[PDB]
Amino acid sequence: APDTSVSNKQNFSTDVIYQIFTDRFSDGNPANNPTGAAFDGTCTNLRLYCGGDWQGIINKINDGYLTGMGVTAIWISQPVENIYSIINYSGVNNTAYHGYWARDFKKTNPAYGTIADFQNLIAAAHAKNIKVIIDFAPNHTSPASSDQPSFAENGRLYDNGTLLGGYTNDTQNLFHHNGGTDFSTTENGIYKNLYDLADLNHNNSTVDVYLKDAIKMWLDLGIDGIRMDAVKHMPFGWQKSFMAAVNNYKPVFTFGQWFLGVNEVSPENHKFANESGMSLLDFRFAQKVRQVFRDNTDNMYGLKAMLEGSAADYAQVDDQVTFIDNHDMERFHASNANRRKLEQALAFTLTSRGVPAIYYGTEQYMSGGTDPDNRARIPSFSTSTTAYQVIQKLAPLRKSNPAIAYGSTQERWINNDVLIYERKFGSNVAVVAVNRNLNAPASISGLVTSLPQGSYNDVLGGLLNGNTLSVGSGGAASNFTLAAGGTAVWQYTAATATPTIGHVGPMMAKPGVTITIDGRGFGSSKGTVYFGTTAVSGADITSWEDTQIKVKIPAVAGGNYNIKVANAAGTASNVYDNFEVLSGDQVSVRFVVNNATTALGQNVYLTGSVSELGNWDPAKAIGPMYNQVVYQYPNWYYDVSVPAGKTIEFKFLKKQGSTVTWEGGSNHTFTAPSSGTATINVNWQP
Ligand SMILES: OC[C@@H]1C[C@H](O)[C@@H](O)[C@@H](O[C@H]2[C@H](O)[C@@H](O)[C@@H](O[C@H]3[C@H](O)[C@@H](O)[C@@H](F)O[C@@H]3CO)O[C@@H]2CO)O1
Ligand SMILES: OC[C@@H]1C[C@H](O)[C@@H](O)[C@@H](O[C@H]2[C@H](O)[C@@H](O)[C@@H](O[C@H]3[C@H](O)[C@@H](O)[C@@H](F)O[C@@H]3CO)O[C@@H]2CO)O1
Ligand SMILES: *[C@@H]1O[C@H](CO)[C@@H](O[C@H]2O[C@H](CO)[C@@H](O[C@H]3O[C@H](CO)C[C@H](O)[C@H]3O)[C@H](O)[C@H]2O)[C@H](O)[C@H]1O
Ligand SMILES: OC[C@@H]1C[C@H](O)[C@@H](O)[C@@H](O[C@H]2[C@H](O)[C@@H](O)[C@@H](O)O[C@@H]2CO)O1
Ligand SMILES: [Ca+2]
Ligand SMILES: [Ca+2]
Known part of the structure; x- marks a missing residue:
């Protein structure tokens, strides 16, 4: 299969993720709706269940909403059974509609659907070339009170129906009893409770084994990836062991949630992405994007610095999951803001390195403040919005143009308001021009690119006031006007003659496990795979095709190895480093x-x-x-x-x-x- 196939669970760089808040997307089966005080069919009360479920997602997959947009992967709410209690917080009723208050990691949340429904979801999505990522929050169970076992469900943990224990009378030590965190230090945030959430004790063998077994169940159900909640709140070493469990069984693309605030650059965060066995949600990218395009607190130079720094800081920058907003922050689009800001941020995200994730409803110009205001029911399924069209035109480039999926990033033109960058991979190039200044055009002269000689039409078709580009020999572009709020995309694709590695996954596993090496120019005949100096060829190379190689990790000593391949003719590729053999x-x-x-x-x-x-x-x-x-x-x-x-x-x-x-x-x-x-x-x- 080719690198772009829906069957590729190790690489999401060619995909576009659509983050669905299950309850707020589509209620395809009203029969599974919660009732009474826990429900609000009108979705007026944003803290109660609204009815959105898996059947609904299936419907939207089948009716072309997602596919028509170019979405190729979905990230859904945690699917596990959550507490059924209606919590009263300062006179306000709260439910587990969000899916983050688990009670049993081995069962489904009946409001979302049954196990059968889940299978159907996996099947329907796969049938439409859409990958399925599930949220997973092994950091905790649910809201609890040690000296008030009557509160909520006391953070009780069940194992496929069998009660393991609760927060109160935790003689087993299934949970941490160190108080609550103030986020003052990483250690503080790991070993203390997040708010009132019963903190699972990953040092407890039962908890450890249970969680690993639970994920295995989901892997067996056919998930394509995992979004790990609160990774900064669990022991890093434990998480590494968790990723090893996954990778040594059925490896799937996994990314963790590690919040970064405005202007925050964390070496610890880099190290985690670099050595944990999972990548991360790109908060650095998201925060910078918001400063530049939304809040006007930074300019293009800051955007460029983030791009350059991140590419150096993250060993596998292409694995970082980018976004412009999410369910834990105010929506990007402010009700009174110019829509072009959102459109540009989207265009930027979709054509930039990593794995883009779009929070449901972004394309409908949904606005909303902090939780739960940012979780309203999607108001429309219109394909006619400018934002929808932007995604529709750009998302597919991740599949058709490898420069976008795996390319390097190079600033080609820049000023306070304008950034022109180039993505390059093999015989593939993409040039993106963005003018954030909504009132002033820019005069672009001296732009040099890697594009072959010729005229290039804007991929956006002028949707965002883009223009045609004229390139001479040497890649120099003729002078042009970049309209106010202008955004344009120019590209060039061609077959790559030399083997070029664009991605490797997973990046950590024991010998015998199969890894996926994706790229271009591998050729059709089996070649050689190198782990450091060690050569692998023949049988251990399960499959080999132009854009994708499947190979078993050789029995080399544990350590860090650089990956490289050579085609049947003996031509070596570039080196993809940092592979960890356990x-x-x-x-x-x-x-x-x-x-x-x-x-x-x-x-x-x-x-x-x-x-x-x-x-x-x-x-x-x-x-x-x-x-x-x-x-x-x-x-x-x-x-x-x-x-x-x-x-x-x-x-x-x-x-x-x-x-x-x-x-x-x-x-x-x-x-x-x-x-x-x-x-x-x-x-x-x-
Ligand atoms: O190949 C010649 C030239 C020599 C420079 O040392 C090298 O950096 C590179 O120059 C590029 C810049 O790096 C690009 O940023 C861009 O420059 C733009 C400015 O970005 C823009 O603000 C405005 F000053 O126009 C400049 C172009 O004239 O292009 C140049 C190459 O033209 O390469
Ligand atoms: O170089 C190979 C070396 C051969 C030894 O037989 C093997 O044990 C291993 O050596 C390790 C030591 O076992 C470690 O203890 C450590 O040595 C430290 C000392 O512990 C410390 O007191 C100080 F003398 O520095 C030593 C390191 O310079 O590391 C060595 C490997 O360097 O491997
Ligand atoms: C990662 O996990 C967290 C923790 O579950 C998710 O948040 C959910 O849980 C929060 C705490 O129960 C919910 O927020 C409530 O409590 C906070 C604390 O003051 C204030 C809010 O007003 C409450 O709703 C939150 O709604 C849940 O989403 C994250 O979403 C997830 O990314
Ligand atoms: O608690 C973390 C803290 C970080 C410091 O960098 C590290 O040195 C250590 O600090 C110790 C001091 O080294 C020791 O002299 C004394 O001051 O206690 C602190 C720990 O509280 O740990
Ligand atoms: Ca329903
Ligand atoms: Ca914890």
Whole structure:
């Protein structure tokens, strides 16, 4: 199959995701609607169920609404059974219409549908070349009160109907009892409750095993990807182990929700996207886009800096899920704003690197403030809006033009208000011009591109006041006027002669697992795949075609490897780096070191005899470790993904910058569990 196929669960870069708030999209089966105080068929009361369900999505898939727009993937509300309680918050009734208050990760939310309905949804979507991503929120269950078990459902966790336990009388320690977070530190936000949400204890073997088994159920149902809720709120090491469970079973494109505020650039966030085994929702991109096109708090230079910085910061920038708004922020379009702002932001997003996600109703100019105002029922299914047409014209380019899906990004022309950028991949090019100034045109002269000589019609057809481009030899464009609020797209596509890797997924797994290498120019005959210096050819290459290769990871030692391919003729491709070969199946283990004193700015890290611990390389050590919540300084702790059942030697380090202080004495040793979790507690050796 080609890279663009709906069957490709490892790569969404050629797709356009449509984020559906299930309850607010389409009620295709009124018979499953909740009732009484929990329901509002008119959807006036935005905190109650409105009736939107899976049957509704199926209908919209079948009637051309989504397909006509060029949408090729949907991200739906968490499908698992949520609490049925109607919570009264300061005199206001609240329900689980949003799907984020889970009670049983092994059952469906009856309001959305039955398991059968889910299967039908998967089937209907696939039939229309639409991939299905489910939201998944393993950070917590639901609202709870320890000293008020009568409140809500006490955050009770069920296993396919079987009660595991609740927040109250949590003798099992299924949950964290560390209070609530103020978001003051990453550690604080991980080990304390988000609001009043019962925080699941990922260090508890039952919880750990249960969650991994639960996801497996969904994978078996045929999902194509996962949107992980609150990834900044769960132990990173645990999440890595979770991603390993997924990848070592049935890998699917996974992206996490890690909020970034205006102007926030987080190295920790970069590291997570780079080493967790999952990518992230691109808040950096979204926030910058809002500043530039919506709020006027930054200009094109800021947009350019975000593009350049992000491309360097994220090992796989093409895996970051971009967006302009979502259910947790005010809608992009302000009721009184010029619609062109929204249209441009959309055009920008659709033609930029990563994986674009469109919040349902954006195309209908929905406006709305903070939750729940940003979750109204979609008011229309009109294909006639300018925004709908913008998506319709641009979304498909992700499939037809690999420069858009996998290309580099280069600024070609810029000023406060104008940005002209170029996407390039193989013999494919796309040039996008955006003039955010709604009142002033710009005179574009000196524009140089990689486009072949000739005249280029705006892909947008002048929809956003774009114009035709005239390119001479050398790629120089003739002078032109970029209209006020103008947005234009010019492209060129052709067969690529040389093997070129545009994407690899998953990026982390154990030997034997099949990975997908996508791109162009691979040729039709089986070639060679390289993992670092190791060559793979023949049988282990399951399938090979011009745009896609399926190959089993060789039994190399755990570590980080650069991927490269060569066609049957021996011509090598570019290198796709950062591939992580795991040492085997993973388990989440908590490491605790006592009496490790440090000076301000100096932190404790973990190192050891397996690639998962950085193979004794301080530059690859695990940390910095925590020392506030679960354990207190001078004691430090950290949850780490390690190879199951392996005997591992390790030591702790004290690092300040790249300066390292090693624990004295001999290495510590332990044998990782075969399944579930474990806690290894030792003392710092001077
Ligand atoms: O190839 C010649 C030229 C030499 C420069 O050192 C190099 O940067 C590159 O120049 C590009 C700029 O990088 C582009 O930004 C653009 O310049 C535009 C400005 O962006 C715009 O503000 C206005 F000053 O017009 C400039 C063009 O005259 O194009 C130039 C190349 O023309 O390459
Ligand atoms: O270079 C290969 C080396 C051979 C050893 O037999 C094997 O154990 C492994 O060595 C590890 C040590 O086991 C680690 O303890 C650590 O050594 C640290 C010391 O712990 C520390 O006290 C300080 F002397 O620095 C040493 C590192 O420079 O790392 C080595 C690998 O470098 O691998
Ligand atoms: C990631 O997960 C969170 C947590 O579930 C989602 O938010 C949902 O849960 C929130 C808390 O229950 C809901 O918000 C309520 O509580 C906040 C706290 O003050 C204020 C709101 O007014 C309440 O509705 C929220 O509505 C849910 O969506 C995120 O949406 C998800 O991305
Ligand atoms: O709690 C995190 C904090 C971050 C610092 O960078 C790290 O040094 C350490 O801080 C220690 C100091 O090193 C120690 O001297 C003493 O001041 O306690 C703090 C921890 O509260 O941890
Ligand atoms: Ca319904
Ligand atoms: Ca948590």
